[PDB]
Design a protein around this motif. Structure first.
Motif, mmCIF file in Angstrom:
data_model
loop_
_atom_site.group_PDB
_atom_site.id
_atom_site.type_symbol
_atom_site.label_atom_id
_atom_site.label_comp_id
_atom_site.label_asym_id
_atom_site.label_seq_id
_atom_site.Cartn_x
_atom_site.Cartn_y
_atom_site.Cartn_z
ATOM 1 N N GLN A 242 -7.164 6.328 -3.505
ATOM 2 C CA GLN A 242 -8.386 5.734 -2.718
ATOM 3 C C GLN A 242 -9.222 5.217 -3.874
ATOM 4 O O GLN A 242 -9.642 3.955 -3.760
ATOM 5 C CB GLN A 242 -9.124 6.484 -1.887
ATOM 6 N N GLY A 243 -9.725 5.795 -4.814
ATOM 7 C CA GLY A 243 -10.383 5.391 -5.887
ATOM 8 C C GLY A 243 -9.854 4.135 -6.600
ATOM 9 O O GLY A 243 -10.587 2.968 -6.580
ATOM 10 N N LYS A 244 -8.638 3.986 -7.090
ATOM 11 C CA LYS A 244 -7.855 2.997 -7.613
ATOM 12 C C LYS A 244 -7.922 1.644 -6.615
ATOM 13 O O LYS A 244 -8.101 0.571 -6.860
ATOM 14 C CB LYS A 244 -6.364 3.357 -7.913
ATOM 15 N N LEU A 245 -7.333 1.844 -5.180
ATOM 16 C CA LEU A 245 -7.482 0.872 -4.291
ATOM 17 C C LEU A 245 -8.700 0.356 -4.061
ATOM 18 O O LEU A 245 -8.810 -0.895 -3.853
ATOM 19 C CB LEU A 245 -6.858 1.516 -2.987
ATOM 20 N N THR A 246 -9.843 1.288 -4.051
ATOM 21 C CA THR A 246 -11.181 0.312 -3.933
ATOM 22 C C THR A 246 -11.650 -0.481 -5.125
ATOM 23 O O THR A 246 -12.235 -1.302 -5.101
ATOM 24 C CB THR A 246 -12.342 1.746 -3.890
ATOM 25 N N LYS A 247 -11.399 0.094 -6.443
ATOM 26 C CA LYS A 247 -11.558 -0.592 -7.488
ATOM 27 C C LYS A 247 -10.636 -1.969 -7.576
ATOM 28 O O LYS A 247 -11.329 -3.097 -7.898
ATOM 29 C CB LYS A 247 -11.050 0.315 -8.821
ATOM 30 N N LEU A 248 -9.432 -1.801 -7.200
ATOM 31 C CA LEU A 248 -8.587 -2.997 -7.126
ATOM 32 C C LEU A 248 -9.226 -4.278 -6.081
ATOM 33 O O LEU A 248 -9.311 -5.268 -6.052
ATOM 34 C CB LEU A 248 -7.101 -2.823 -6.643
ATOM 35 N N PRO A 315 -4.901 -2.793 3.742
ATOM 36 C CA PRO A 315 -5.067 -1.310 4.377
ATOM 37 C C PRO A 315 -3.978 -0.986 5.362
ATOM 38 O O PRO A 315 -3.397 0.155 5.325
ATOM 39 C CB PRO A 315 -6.551 -1.505 4.989
ATOM 40 N N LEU A 316 -3.572 -1.752 6.151
ATOM 41 C CA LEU A 316 -2.525 -1.374 7.365
ATOM 42 C C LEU A 316 -1.386 -1.224 6.290
ATOM 43 O O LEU A 316 -0.514 -0.058 6.896
ATOM 44 C CB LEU A 316 -2.511 -2.599 8.183
ATOM 45 N N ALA A 317 -0.787 -2.039 5.662
ATOM 46 C CA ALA A 317 0.537 -1.602 4.812
ATOM 47 C C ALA A 317 0.343 -0.422 3.937
ATOM 48 O O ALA A 317 1.414 0.515 4.123
ATOM 49 C CB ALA A 317 0.793 -2.807 3.939
ATOM 50 N N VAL A 318 -0.669 -0.099 3.444
ATOM 51 C CA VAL A 318 -0.935 1.023 2.522
ATOM 52 C C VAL A 318 -0.868 2.182 3.568
ATOM 53 O O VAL A 318 -0.111 3.399 3.247
ATOM 54 C CB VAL A 318 -2.256 1.003 1.599
ATOM 55 N N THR A 319 -1.597 2.179 4.741
ATOM 56 C CA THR A 319 -1.321 3.153 5.818
ATOM 57 C C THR A 319 -0.100 3.530 6.101
ATOM 58 O O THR A 319 0.216 4.589 6.489
ATOM 59 C CB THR A 319 -2.647 3.175 6.792
ATOM 60 N N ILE A 320 0.534 2.529 6.564
ATOM 61 C CA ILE A 320 1.699 2.728 7.038
ATOM 62 C C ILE A 320 2.836 3.251 6.197
ATOM 63 O O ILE A 320 3.744 4.096 6.564
ATOM 64 C CB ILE A 320 2.364 1.318 7.477
ATOM 65 N N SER A 731 2.910 0.251 -5.553
ATOM 66 C CA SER A 731 3.088 -0.895 -6.672
ATOM 67 C C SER A 731 3.870 -1.923 -6.268
ATOM 68 O O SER A 731 3.339 -2.891 -6.568
ATOM 69 C CB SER A 731 3.431 -0.264 -8.135
ATOM 70 N N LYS A 732 5.118 -1.735 -5.910
ATOM 71 C CA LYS A 732 5.874 -2.733 -5.753
ATOM 72 C C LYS A 732 5.304 -3.603 -4.449
ATOM 73 O O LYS A 732 5.291 -4.907 -4.303
ATOM 74 C CB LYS A 732 7.498 -2.394 -5.204
ATOM 75 N N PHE A 733 4.822 -3.073 -3.332
ATOM 76 C CA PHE A 733 4.132 -3.813 -2.181
ATOM 77 C C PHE A 733 3.103 -4.745 -2.725
ATOM 78 O O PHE A 733 2.842 -5.788 -2.407
ATOM 79 C CB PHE A 733 3.789 -3.052 -1.061
ATOM 80 N N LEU A 734 2.288 -4.314 -3.775
ATOM 81 C CA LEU A 734 1.013 -4.834 -4.272
ATOM 82 C C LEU A 734 1.641 -6.175 -4.835
ATOM 83 O O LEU A 734 0.973 -7.029 -5.001
ATOM 84 C CB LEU A 734 0.170 -3.955 -5.107
ATOM 85 N N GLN A 735 2.719 -6.036 -5.831
ATOM 86 C CA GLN A 735 3.570 -7.068 -6.526
ATOM 87 C C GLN A 735 3.865 -8.252 -5.559
ATOM 88 O O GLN A 735 3.714 -9.315 -5.868
ATOM 89 C CB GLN A 735 4.677 -6.439 -7.299
ATOM 90 N N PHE A 736 4.523 -7.829 -4.383
ATOM 91 C CA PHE A 736 4.769 -8.846 -3.311
ATOM 92 C C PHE A 736 3.459 -9.586 -2.890
ATOM 93 O O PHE A 736 3.419 -10.677 -2.967
ATOM 94 C CB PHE A 736 5.396 -8.116 -2.374
ATOM 95 N N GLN A 737 2.578 -8.893 -2.369
ATOM 96 C CA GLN A 737 1.206 -9.363 -1.656
ATOM 97 C C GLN A 737 0.520 -10.200 -2.801
ATOM 98 O O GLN A 737 -0.133 -11.326 -2.170
ATOM 99 C CB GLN A 737 0.462 -8.326 -1.008
ATOM 100 N N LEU A 738 0.487 -9.858 -4.000
ATOM 101 C CA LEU A 738 -0.392 -10.570 -4.885
ATOM 102 C C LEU A 738 0.259 -12.185 -5.043
ATOM 103 O O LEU A 738 -0.552 -12.975 -4.955
ATOM 104 C CB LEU A 738 -0.674 -9.818 -5.991
ATOM 105 N N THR A 739 1.662 -12.202 -5.303
ATOM 106 C CA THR A 739 1.889 -13.306 -5.439
ATOM 107 C C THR A 739 1.870 -14.119 -4.043
ATOM 108 O O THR A 739 1.372 -15.442 -4.153
ATOM 109 C CB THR A 739 3.523 -13.341 -5.330
ATOM 110 N N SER A 777 6.149 -3.899 4.037
ATOM 111 C CA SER A 777 5.721 -2.806 3.330
ATOM 112 C C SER A 777 6.706 -1.617 3.641
ATOM 113 O O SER A 777 6.975 -0.675 2.939
ATOM 114 C CB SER A 777 4.213 -2.615 3.676
ATOM 115 N N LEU A 778 6.867 -1.409 5.013
ATOM 116 C CA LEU A 778 7.983 -0.449 5.577
ATOM 117 C C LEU A 778 9.330 -0.787 4.878
ATOM 118 O O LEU A 778 10.147 0.601 4.837
ATOM 119 C CB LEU A 778 7.998 -0.360 7.109
ATOM 120 N N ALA A 779 9.635 -1.948 4.682
ATOM 121 C CA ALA A 779 11.022 -2.225 4.058
ATOM 122 C C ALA A 779 11.009 -1.617 2.565
ATOM 123 O O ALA A 779 12.319 -1.503 2.273
ATOM 124 C CB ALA A 779 11.498 -3.532 4.269
#
Ligand SMILES: CCCCC/C=C/C/C=C/C/C=C/C/C=C/CCCC(=O)O[C@@H](COC(=O)CCCCCCCCCCCCCCCCC)COP(=O)(O)O[C@@H]1[C@H](O)[C@H](O)[C@@H](OP(=O)(O)O)[C@H](OP(=O)(O)O)[C@H]1O
Ligand code: BEF
Ligand SMILES: [Mg+2]
Length: 941
Positions: A242-248, A315-320, A731-739, A777-779
């Motif tokens: 959660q700390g890393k996610l909040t910082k990001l 948030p929803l993707a991370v929670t799922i 990490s990989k979901f973040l890579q997709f979403q940021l692009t 994210s689930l995939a």
């Protein structure tokens, strides 16, 4: 005037030191009884409800749980997060500012916030309710002369309670008088062996400890919360991810603000320059009515660019992903309770494990035996020796042991057999069961009345014996005791299947002692079984025990030990090569802790690392005045493997010293495993605290995060595997979403400043950000973990989420998507020979030209995730896709839904039907992403 503070000060001072203190503070434990209105006979003589309430000022002896709320409190607690705050603020300011004379984005963000809050709250509530499923009285007290049963809640200070074997002590007490008493303090204290309680030495009865054998009476000193268990229990009342996610999140939101400021500044400057280059406005009084409206519209244009930048689906993707991982982990007997402690174990750097209960089975069993002058390092088949020795041994063990001591089946599912009686001769009794025999018929044939004479255990001689005269007119005697005590009183031994041979004390007792030394070196206590038969005529005198106890015939010598769990030695070896160093903190003896530490591999021979006792540990850290400074702890914690004789405070001090230390290069994440009330305080301070499920007290499971239901140490490794897998999936979901976000924000910026129309409508982007990416994210989080994850070194506590290779893929694929979108926007009209839709009167039918751009933007993302499955520099992005049916199902479902949306959309989706040739061209332009993936992978990182 009892001043209970000094009464509880008399507690927590176990050992012979208590006897010394009570000698100077009081008399001989009868003075304290006189300081109260009680006497050893008929203690608290008058029940006297008024006097009972007068003494109730000490305690009521009852502690209830909380059970905070059903659903509302958890929901309210979930709403106080940094990410959700900025999401809701942006949503509300966008919704409010859409009406200044917008409707879709605010509703979408609010719905996403509601969904994530509900999922988190429901998962936490379900896990908390499921935890209490596995966790789901009156004893003799001499009130007025006659002992009368009284409920636990009515115990008050001064009551005299009678204790017999099998009882559970409800409150702390002082030993008044009784027979030989043995108390099992494995849970509270942590000592493996049974502790003998006597008035002379160690008269400190503690609450919550079983009594094995003996009977007596005690006073009650601390009734309720003041008891030893109560102090620890009431002391028990931001995961690393959660700390890393909040910082990001606060870094990403900061970046979009600069872009919004750029848009507003550039557009306002362009307007001002263009207006004031051809002519000059009055500048005097025209500024009031209409000049401010231009700037307010420019501010709205800037804010609508700010809104796009922030990721509303993170948030929803991370929670799922976390929920799916938690559900998949329960099949390995790990019951995560907070849903955010799933990842904290992956990057662990130290483990502090309790000795008794956790590393050891906490049951005395025979490890190795010596029968028939043939050493057996392992429990043998009963057919091995196959002689009269087997039956003779079985008879000796069964008859000689006390009939109250018996072993009972668990009568449950997946549980270890229970041991009620003295467990020093219960492993010896279980040795018979390990030899696949039956002890119960032998005892049932001969009860106590048929046993002629019994020699009970005495302080003078550490031996116990019995004699039975049934088998014939001749007599038979059996003896059991310590090794050297009985060996020196032994004159003959059995040799294999042969008869007895002379055990003369010349080189033969010496060889037997020679084989004894390895048993004592390995920590095993040696106990031998002997026998001797008596002639009927003349009748021997049993009163004269001088010679009848001698001239014995030993049958075997067996080693008794508290063994390690079968799977611990290998589990520690795996987790030690993954960068995790292991320590042992326990309250037992230093000699016993060291012996088992070597077997588990915690300390290897060579005396490389220091092992320190608790008293020295407390003495060294304190800097004279009596306060703890971090320098002293930093001195000794890097190379402290074994810590013995530690109170619960010492464990809390050690795990606090490691966490709050910058002596090493990298910050430490400490995980603590335990099963007893000792590890209460130490489980709370730990970042992630495991606890044994079936062999753990209720206090340990109250302070834990991940409960091991199957209480087997091999599931610690799988927790590491799943934590690292969760980190990779995020990490990989973040890579997709940021692009996705970078491409969208750049397109919006271009469509606001240079041109007045943006090809990506608000409705179109909602589906991509909310619905499509949530299923993406689930995939990505469904790839099965592999054993190869246990070779990577742990990551730091402060290492940013976005690695260096992730920044190559995020910016690398933003280049490819931008160029094609721009070319299709500007010059695509001539490529497709379709009428331009670049400018509209804001009330026009949906142009086919912009639908091409929208379908191209969507179709490039579908092949971006098939590329985003390799965070590292893996070129083959198609590996193992067949071992992932849900991934392919999600991709195909998204493709079909995209077809349905674009073909039958109409006005609401700003889409028009397309001919199949344009569909093929768009599919090829999407497929080009896979080819560009290899090129973007080729460049060194
Ligand atoms: C795509 O790249 O993310 C965009 C955000 O997406 C948008 O959507 C923003 C919208 C506008 C897009 C324009 C670009 C830019 O923000 P970021 O997340 O990149 O910024 C961090 C931050 O700067 C840390 O401080 C760095 O850490 P360090 O301390 O080392 O500098 C870290 O760099 P690293 O990966 O090396 O750790 C960066 O990632
Ligand atoms: F010895 Be452990 F702390 F139960
Ligand atoms: Mg324990």
């Amino acid at each position: 005037g009892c001043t209970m503070e000094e009464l509880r000060s008399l507690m927590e001072l176990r050992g012979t030191e208590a006897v010394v203190k009570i000698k100077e503070t009081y008399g001989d434990t009868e003075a304290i009884c006189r300081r109260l209105k009680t006497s050893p006979v008929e203690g608290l003589p008058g029940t006297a409800p008024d006097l009972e309430k007068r003494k109730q000022i000490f305690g009521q002896n009852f502690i209830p749980p909380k059970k905070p709320k059903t659903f509302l409190q958890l929901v309210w607690e979930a709403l106080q997060d940094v990410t959700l705050i900025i999401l809701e603020i942006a949503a509300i300011i966008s919704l409010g500012l859409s009406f200044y004379h917008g409707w879709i984005e605010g509703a979408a963000i609010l719905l996403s916030v509601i969904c994530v809050v509900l999922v988190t709250a429901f998962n936490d509530w379900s896990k908390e309710k499921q935890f209490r499923g596995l966790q789901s009285q009156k004893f003799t007290v001499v009130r007025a002369g006659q002992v009368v049963q009284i409920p636990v809640a009515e115990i008050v200070v001064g009551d005299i309670a009678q204790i017999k074997y099998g009882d559970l002590l409800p409150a702390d007490g002082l030993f008044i008088q009784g027979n030989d008493l043995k108390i099992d303090e494995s849970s509270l204290t942590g000592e493996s062996d049974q502790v003998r309680k006597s008035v002379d030495k160690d008269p400190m009865l503690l609450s919550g400890t079983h009594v094995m054998e003996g009977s007596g009476r005690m006073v009650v000193t601390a009734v309720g919360v003041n008891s030893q268990t109560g102090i620890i229990f009431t002391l028990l009342g931001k995961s690393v991810l959660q700390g890393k996610l909040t910082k990001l999140a606060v870094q990403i939101g900061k970046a979009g603000l600069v872009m919004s400021a750029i848009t507003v500044i550039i557009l306002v400057l362009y307007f001002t320059v263009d207006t004031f280059v051809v002519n000059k406005k009055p500048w005097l009084t025209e500024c009031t009515p209409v000049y401010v409206q231009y700037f307010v519209k420019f501010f709205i244009i800037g804010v609508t660019v700010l809104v796009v930048a922030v990721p509303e689906g993170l948030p929803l993707a991370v929670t799922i992903s976390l929920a799916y991982s938690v559900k998949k982990m329960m099949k390995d007997n790990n019951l995560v309770r907070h849903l955010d402690a799933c990842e904290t174990m992956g990057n662990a750097t130290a483990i502090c494990s309790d000795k008794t209960g956790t590393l050891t089975t906490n049951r005395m069993t025979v490890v190795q035996a010596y029968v028939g002058d043939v050493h057996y390092k392992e429990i043998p088949d009963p057919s091995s020796i196959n002689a009269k020795t087997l039956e003779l041994l079985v008879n000796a063990i069964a008859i000689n042991s006390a009939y109250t001591t018996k072993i009972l089946p668990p009568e449950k599912e997946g549980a270890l057999p229970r041991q009620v009686g003295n467990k020093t001769e219960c492993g010896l009794l279980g040795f018979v069961l390990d030899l696949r025999q039956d002890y119960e018929p032998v005892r049932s044939q001969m009860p106590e009345e048929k046993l002629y004479k019994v020699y009970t255990f005495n302080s003078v001689r550490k031996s116990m014996s019995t004699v039975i005269k049934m088998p014939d007119e001749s007599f038979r005697m059996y003896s059991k005791g310590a090794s050297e005590i009985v060996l020196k009183k032994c004159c003959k031994i059995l040799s294999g299947a042969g008869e007895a041979r002379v055990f003369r004390p010349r080189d033969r007792d010496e060889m037997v002692k020679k084989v004894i030394e390895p048993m004592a070196c390995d920590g095993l206590r040696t106990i031998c079984v002997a026998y001797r038969d008596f002639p009927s005529s003349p009748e021997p005198d049993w009163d004269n025990e001088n010679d009848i106890l001698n001239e014995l015939t030993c049958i075997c010598v067996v080693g008794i030990e508290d063994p390690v769990r079968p799977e611990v030695p290998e589990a520690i070896r795996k987790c030690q090569r993954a960068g995790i160093t292991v320590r042992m903190v326990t309250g037992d003896n230093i000699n016993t802790a060291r012996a088992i530490a070597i077997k588990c591999g915690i300390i290897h021979p060579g005396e490389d690392f220091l092992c320190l006792e608790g008293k020295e540990f407390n003495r060294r850290i304190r800097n004279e005045k009596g306060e703890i400074e971090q320098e002293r702890i930093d001195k000794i914690w890097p190379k402290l493997r074994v810590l013995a004789r530690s109170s619960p405070t010492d464990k809390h001090t050690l795990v606090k010293g490691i966490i709050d230390s910058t002596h090493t290069e990298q910050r430490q994440v400490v995980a603590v495993t335990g099963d007893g009330t000792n590890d209460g305080p130490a489980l709370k301070k730990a970042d992630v605290g495991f606890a044994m499920g079936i062999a753990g007290t209720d206090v340990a499971k109250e302070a834990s995060d991940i409960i091991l239901t199957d209480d087997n140490f091999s599931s610690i490794v799988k927790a590491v595997m799943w934590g690292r897998n969760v980190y990779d999936s995020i990490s990989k979901f973040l890579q997709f979403q940021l692009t996705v976000n970078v491409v969208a924000v750049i397109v919006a910026f271009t469509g606001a400043c240079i041109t007045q129309d943006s090809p990506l409508k608000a409705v179109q982007m909602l589906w991509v950000n909310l619905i499509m990416d949530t299923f993406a994210s689930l995939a990505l989080a469904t790839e099965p973990p592999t054993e190869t994850l246990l070779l990577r070194k742990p990551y730091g506590r402060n290492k940013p989420l976005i690695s260096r290779t992730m920044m190559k893929n995020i910016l690398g694929h933003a280049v490819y998507q931008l160029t094609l979108i721009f070319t299709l926007l500007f010059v695509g009209e001539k490529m497709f020979q379709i009428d331009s839709g670049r400018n509209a009167p804001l009330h026009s039918p949906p142009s086919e030209h912009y639908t091409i751009i929208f379908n191209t933007f969507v179709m490039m993302q579908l092949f971006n995730e098939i590329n985003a499955r390799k965070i590292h520099g893996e070129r083959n992005v198609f590996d193992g896709i067949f071992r992932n049916p849900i991934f392919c199902t999600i991709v195909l479902g998204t493709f079909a839904i995209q077809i349905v949306i674009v073909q039958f959309g109409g006005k609401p989706f700003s889409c028009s039907p397309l001919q199949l040739d344009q569909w093929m061209w768009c599919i090829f332009i999407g497929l080009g992403e896979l080819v560009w993936g290899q090129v973007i992978a080729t460049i060194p990182t």
